[PDB]
Subunit: 457 residues, 3 copies
Amino acid sequence: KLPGDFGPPRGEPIHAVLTSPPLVPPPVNRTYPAKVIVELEVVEKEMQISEGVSYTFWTFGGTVPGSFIRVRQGDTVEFHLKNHPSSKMPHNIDLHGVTGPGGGAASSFTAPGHESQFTFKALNEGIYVYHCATAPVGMHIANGMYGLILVEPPEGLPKVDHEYYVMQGDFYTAGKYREKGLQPFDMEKAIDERPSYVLFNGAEGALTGDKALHAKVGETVRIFVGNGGPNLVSSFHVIGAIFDQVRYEGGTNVQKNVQTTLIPAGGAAVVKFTARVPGSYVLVDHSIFRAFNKGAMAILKIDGAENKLVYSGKELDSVYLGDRAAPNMSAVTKATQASVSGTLTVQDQVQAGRALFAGTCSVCHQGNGAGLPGVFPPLAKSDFLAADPKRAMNIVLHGLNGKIKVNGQEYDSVMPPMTQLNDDEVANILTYVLNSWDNPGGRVSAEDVKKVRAQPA
Amino acid sequence: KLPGDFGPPRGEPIHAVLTSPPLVPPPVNRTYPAKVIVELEVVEKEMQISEGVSYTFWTFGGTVPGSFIRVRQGDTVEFHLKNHPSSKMPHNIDLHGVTGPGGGAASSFTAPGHESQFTFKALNEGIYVYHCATAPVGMHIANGMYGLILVEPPEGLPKVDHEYYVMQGDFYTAGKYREKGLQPFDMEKAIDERPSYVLFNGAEGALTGDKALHAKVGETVRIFVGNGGPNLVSSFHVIGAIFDQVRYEGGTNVQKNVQTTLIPAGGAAVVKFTARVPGSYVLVDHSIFRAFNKGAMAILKIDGAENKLVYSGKELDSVYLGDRAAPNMSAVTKATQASVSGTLTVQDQVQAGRALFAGTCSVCHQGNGAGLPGVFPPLAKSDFLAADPKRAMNIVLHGLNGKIKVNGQEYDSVMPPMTQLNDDEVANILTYVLNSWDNPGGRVSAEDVKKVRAQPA
Amino acid sequence: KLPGDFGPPRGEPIHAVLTSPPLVPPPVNRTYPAKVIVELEVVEKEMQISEGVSYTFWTFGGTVPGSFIRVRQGDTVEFHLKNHPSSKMPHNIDLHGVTGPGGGAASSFTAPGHESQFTFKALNEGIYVYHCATAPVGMHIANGMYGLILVEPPEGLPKVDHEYYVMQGDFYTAGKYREKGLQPFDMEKAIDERPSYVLFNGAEGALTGDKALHAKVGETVRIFVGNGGPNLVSSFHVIGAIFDQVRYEGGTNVQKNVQTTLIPAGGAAVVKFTARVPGSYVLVDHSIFRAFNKGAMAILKIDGAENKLVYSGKELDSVYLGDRAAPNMSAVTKATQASVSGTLTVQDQVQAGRALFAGTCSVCHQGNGAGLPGVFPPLAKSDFLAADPKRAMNIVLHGLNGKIKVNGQEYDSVMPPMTQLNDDEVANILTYVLNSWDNPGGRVSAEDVKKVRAQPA
Ligand code: HEC
Ligand code: HEC
Ligand code: HEC
Ligand SMILES: [Cu+2]
Ligand SMILES: [Cu+2]
Ligand SMILES: [Cu+2]
Ligand SMILES: [Cu+2]
Ligand SMILES: [Cu+2]
Ligand SMILES: [Cu+2]
């Protein structure tokens, strides 16, 4: 006997309503098996992978991850895949959870401007990745072609206050992290499993700041967590909290009371969180350079009353979250645009640099540039800075050590090099500093920094 | 009290019968503990890791993975390791599941032409990796020195229709993927965990096409799945199906109803599959560039009646499986041999290119070269191709974009670069195309391609 | 209702006594919730990451991993973080298991010479990683800022004979593995997840030889195992044994009877071992090049009577453990020091080379240099060696193959290149060989080897 043996479809055919991340369709709330018609369209389009960084994504439904599909175990799914006429590549789909060769792949092969369909019975309850299955498969997945399908148990999942949709991916650009412009896919980096970005929901900042997920103290939150890969395994973790439950795919096993859980490439899990004290809870890949150097952080922000008996401390700030503590970094997008257009102003640079200074520089120099007398020198009204802005470019790129005098006080410490910052980033940060705190004004250009990078002091 | 406390060996000594992958010895079918004599011989020998690509493997029993060993919990195992006289290196063994230092390693040290033996009690039921334990251990394991030992529970495992033996490994060649010739081991790639091949059972195609595993609709299949490493963790997955059960080593935990499962380096699992609808089910490492760019795919092919109520779609084809959809790629081996011998004919190239065109080119241009008018230009009777075969070499290596006219129709799309193809591969593919579909004939040589690669248009 | 709801703190405030690795504080042995005051001080200091290789570690409590903290579920923890005045960087803490944003991070931000404190309730039983949470977070963690906190269940853990503390980390030096001197942190290697060292407890050899963990036949051993990362996932394994139990963090799930288990980056587990036969049991990351090429091996040495019915074989030796079979490699530290001071003697080199010869060379040439006539040529009284010591440098770096005659006998085999050995290592090994076994004496210098490396034969 096959699983999901609930009899023939009954009632009326249902046209599935799909949702865009980070939202989820409502519970199916149904006691009978149905014929469910799913319509999904592939769209190839440029989007911002980071501020001022464009990428040609290939998408199911216009988003990365693709639209969320929700059905019931025992349903008959008539799956329609359309490929938008603007596409250049053919596409198809493999849904995990499908019983049949390729998960649908042969029957869903769809050239630009065409449509395909196939039918399958959802035998398997669980949360499942779906993805493109078109040669070269890794290129298609790396370009964003993945999402989740939930096959509910017949009785439905337990009710919760919120349901969200979060999916990790690894991305491979020709340029380095935060290098501006339209970035091609990089096959060599992909084969070597050396991503430039590791993201939730298709972009840096997709789920941080003003795009955070929300709930209130006392509420329950279910997150459907995918790992589209193509290549990485996520050490998936919530900072400052615990998962009540973690369940992989449709497995019988449920782990309870864990904070860190490994999600295979192509894997998916359902996690549950109970909000206990207010603040921001960070979802990360705890392979830490991914989370803190490549974009792999998302936020669940909890509103409500503090409970000092449980936690006396403060909300997260830029020391830990860096430049993602703030609502957004729109000023960086604006400055990059203005550079392209040849209209970059001092103030455009100042505002971009203000955004980028947070964490990156403020951890030591403070948000007001005051530093800490004798320990971290000031950037505010800094004689040392004013005396030689080219030296300041060298200091950011190449670090500084040894005894120095700043505003009448000796320092004898170490500023690490920050060579991973791009030329525009150094330029904008220093222009911000120069135009703040009674510093002398003026500006530093990306070309100025390019020259210092090519010939260090 | 020790585990496996079933009393002294009884009956007669048993000479274990070992099997070569992908086959498994029969169930032990025994209710008493025995003395089991195991004889395993190390052989160093060249084998084909891919078509036309030789590698010096170091093997237990002549195969990668090594011979499968099957005993019963509570048995006393007298383990004999022989090192063939032709070997250049000493070798030994560490069997996971052994209770004792090194898993046998010190007592099994065996120089070329020698034999060693040691005895251990199998206290631990489970599936276990064994491997060489000779400095430099990583070199020995990377060269193929790993296999599985099953220690059955006293009552035996439940009966199934088929049992198979599949083992992943990561391999490190000096040359790139599919670069022909005898490829040395590459220590630098190994230390960096940057394999050139990721394989099941020691070779590309070892379990695809005419070497697939088989079963019928309704049957149960147990697979003993190892990960020899040395370095990679497998996001082990079955495309288009689900695992009824996954059990690691001898663990108490059994996960049920999962599709994707993480197998540690040096780990092993027993998975169970129930065949429900016919077609090819792909075992992969779902770190996708391994599966689709490095060889990490194996096939379980199911025969029987379609069930349209469960899955209406078609069997897998080259869109998803690429050049492994076909029974084999023997023509590539033959062409490579002929190149070495200086006897390479046009037809040798044509047949090799025919094999390599599948998926790689046919996904867009179709198996008949017709393309799709206005969307993917034809290779069949292509004026554009005929007009400039050196341009065609550049197009394969370096891609093509922009408006073009082919056979009277405008195209305005993007063909990605395919620079990872080796010179012989480009040459053979283009020679196939030129000699098909009313194209003008002639040939492209590997040297022709080498020159275009050294100086792009 | 919140977990750990055991009522208000009672009794007297408790000043936690913290332990340095590999030791653990005693069981709390308490039936009431308490206020527990924890005092931890950050110290930045140079330590030896390997013999003759210094590194500037950043530490919680002077060690890597940091001091072990042990409390009871339901306790109120008043956490004090001090930053030693000698520090150059600010620091803070995120304790997994804390319920609150950042796990403590915002409220624990501490400049050099300062102190911070915050209070949290330990709601969550389990073993948990703690680490620094200061931008750039990956740099801080890579420099050693991680440890474990145990939150006991209210009834305590079951009693065992020994409890130990073992924590894996990945490290990123500018220089290659075993390159001597003070090694800077390497940001590029860190971002790429390409460590030069993978270690237990902060150094090569930290838990090998005379620093092994101990127990006796029949005893139980609990190990609190952390993975500080920052980036790697451990295929954590015990050679020659099995784990009775593995439990992650505070999870409900407990796996029993497994040998190989995946520990996420930032993860922690409690494992249990029962000693059955004497010898050395190796804890490794079974991504094997880590264990055998980067330092990721630790030893649990069991004393007591052999049981030939369970295991007839011998204790581990240098064939498997390599140069870590011996008690220590102090001679390498001494020789490196003497080179720095310009006082390096022949005997300093000889003793360093003796240490390094084990495994590395002895696997084939034997500990006495005799080789195996006709199979592995002798280094003892070797005419071939004496005839040309520059050829001998080339042989170590670049390998040797083909027919040769040594001491009147023909060999026709392959010695692999050993190019990963550093110049001082080759020099010291060859000086050892030259000064042993009736060889002619003299010495080989690091500069001699540098020249052969720059121009191979
Ligand atoms: C702590 C880890 C720091 C971070 C992050 C940044 N800086 Fe820094 N900076 C730091 C120290 C300890 C020092 C002095 C080094 C010494 O030799 O004692 C400095 C110095 C500077 C200076 C020059 C002195 C001055 O004008 O105060 C400049 C211009 C400067 N730092 C700039 C700067 C910027 C823009 C940063 C973000 C990109 C940044 N620093 C980070 C410590 C740390
Ligand atoms: C889809 C992703 C493709 C794959 C895979 C391959 N080709 Fe292609 N090719 C494709 C397009 C869209 C185009 C036109 C580009 C444009 O500027 O509009 C092409 C073009 C060619 C040509 C030249 C035109 C012609 O003769 O039709 C050649 C010779 C060609 N392609 C060859 C070729 C081969 C041999 C491939 C496998 C190695 C291959 N292509 C793959 C799209 C795609
Ligand atoms: C086995 C895998 C070996 C290891 C490890 C090392 N050596 Fe070796 N060595 C080996 C062989 C098979 C040969 C002969 C190669 C052939 O062409 O047949 C050699 C040779 C040497 C020699 C020259 C001959 C002699 O004097 O005996 C030297 C000087 C030598 N080997 C040194 C040496 C050292 C110092 C090693 C550790 C760094 C080492 N070898 C490792 C096999 C193996
Ligand atoms: Cu696609
Ligand atoms: Cu998949
Ligand atoms: Cu071997
Ligand atoms: Cu092993
Ligand atoms: Cu720190
Ligand atoms: Cu953490």
